Design a binder for these strands. Structure first.
Ligand SMILES: Nc1ccn([C@H]2C[C@H](O)[C@@H](COP(=O)(O)OP(=O)(O)OP(=O)(O)O)O2)c(=O)n1
Ligand SMILES: [Ca+2]
Ligand SMILES: [Ca+2]
Length: 411
DNA sequence: TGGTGACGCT
DNA sequence: AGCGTCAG
């Protein structure tokens, strides 16, 4: 009944902002946001601290409008390195966090600021030793128990007490051990980086990711098999990982529902007929809290790319500047690629050029030398047929986006 | 009116 | 190989 594994999702709280605040102490505990390119409307916001989220500041929001919402909003700038954003600060901080996380159990790099962790073996290893010694509530100073109890911190402690009181090879005891380990993990992350995070502990990846978002920030939530019916009864379908797009929308359309629990009243063959073999099976299992997607041992990315958008009147309409932006992208890609070669002992072998006209086109070619000029020229070569232009020195129709991606990595 | 990444389907 | 989807 999907209680074999113990899986945690650790995601950092307002991560880019925590990075900038670790760099600039004037920004700590203040309503502030991280911005991209001041010129257009003060810059698009990409990261909002919680003190600023209280005012209503959101991602994908021009900084100038956010200042209308919150006048006291402080802004920290993303580094700009070749006429384009440079995110190496946050990638290095991410690696900082991922290594600490790797010190406890096998992790799956899920994004720049979160990882899944498979804690089965560590829970067993701690359960064999420590003997029958109980679980002090002092071992979980930030854990919530979803559905308990049946002063926000008073609520928290009452639920934790109800859980610990009502407690061999029991899945709930496993979850408790893993939650203690995650408390440890997170205290280590905070002591060694200054960064704060939330976490979800459960039996699979999706339940862990939902639990991590139940109690943000700087808190962790345990979700047991038993909390699942109650939790899913009012859980909007779109909050589940991969049900936030078109598939999750049509599930609601066809089945005429609203929450996860209502998927239980359907047979597995029904949902397979509705959404496919692999999707019907997965939904039938998911609505009952069961998922088998494993925690893959992969801390390192599989692709390395740079894109630049050229919206509106700024799209590229000369070959003289398509050349130049391809060269800029190849430059940053090459710096990152040499760092990857010397840090991770592996080489990219295939280059992917992606372009858009007013990712409408993607081609691939050979990646043989970590050379910016070679790669820019080969990417150009690979895209020329697209230039409908009859005039030799213009480019029509203009390009809205350029994308360069090194992939197919060999040791 | 941004800049990335994993994965599925054919 | 190229496109479509999903999300941090
Ligand atoms: N559309 C997005 C989503 C994320 N990010 C970057 C900046 C974020 O700091 C980081 C991770 O984003 P999350 O969605 O995980 O959320 P935050 O880390 O900002 O905070 P929280 O998880 O507390 O909401 O990735 C981004 O630039 N654009
Ligand atoms: Ca986060
Ligand atoms: Ca996240």
């Amino acid at each position: 009944t999907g209680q074999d594994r113990v899986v945690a999702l650790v995601d950092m709280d307002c991560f880019f902002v925590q990075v900038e605040q670790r760099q600039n102490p004037h920004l700590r505990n203040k309503p502030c946001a991280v911005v991209q390119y001041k010129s257009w409307k003060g810059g698009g916001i990409i990261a909002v601290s919680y003190e600023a989220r209280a005012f209503g500041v959101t991602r994908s929001m021009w900084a100038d409008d956010a200042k209308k919402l919150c006048p006291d909003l402080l802004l920290a700038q993303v580094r700009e390195s070749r006429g384009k954003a440079n995110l190496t600060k946050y990638r290095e901080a991410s690696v900082e966090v991922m290594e600490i996380m790797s010190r406890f159990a096998v992790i799956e790099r899920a994004s720049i600021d979160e990882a899944y962790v498979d804690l089965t073996s560590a829970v067993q290893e701690r359960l064999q030793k420590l003997q029958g010694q109980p679980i002090s509530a002092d071992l979980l100073p930030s854990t919530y128990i979803e559905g308990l109890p049946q002063q926000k911190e008073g609520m928290r402690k009452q639920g934790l007490f109800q859980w610990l009181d009502s407690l061999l090879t029991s899945p709930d005891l496993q979850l408790t051990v893993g939650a203690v380990i995650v408390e440890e993990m997170r205290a280590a992350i905070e002591r060694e980086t200054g960064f704060q995070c939330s976490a979800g502990i459960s039996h699979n990846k999706v339940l862990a990711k939902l639990a991590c978002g139940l109690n943000k920030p700087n808190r962790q939530t345990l979700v047991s098999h038993g909390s699942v019916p109650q939790l899913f009864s009012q859980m909007p379908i779109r909050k589940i990982r991969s049900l936030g797009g078109k598939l999750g929308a049509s599930v609601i359309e066809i089945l005429g529902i609203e929450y996860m629990g209502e998927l239980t009243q359907f047979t597995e063959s029904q949902l397979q007929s509705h959404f496919g073999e692999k999707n019907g099976s997965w939904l039938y299992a998911m609505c009952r809290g069961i998922e088998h997607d494993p925690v893959k041992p992969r801390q390192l990315p599989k692709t390395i790319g740079c894109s630049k958008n050229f919206p509106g009147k700024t799209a590229l309409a000369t070959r003289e500047q398509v050349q130049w932006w391809l060269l800029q992208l190849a430059q940053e890609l090459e710096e990152r690629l040499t760092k990857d070669r010397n840090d991770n002992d592996r080489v990219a072998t295939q280059l992917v050029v992606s372009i858009r006209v007013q990712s409408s086109l993607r081609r691939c070619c050979a990646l043989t030398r970590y050379d910016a000029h070679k790669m820019s020229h080969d990417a150009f070569t690979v895209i020329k047929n697209c230039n409908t232009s009859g005039i030799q020195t213009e480019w029509s129709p203009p390009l809205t986006m350029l994308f360069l991606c090194a992939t197919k990595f060999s040791a």
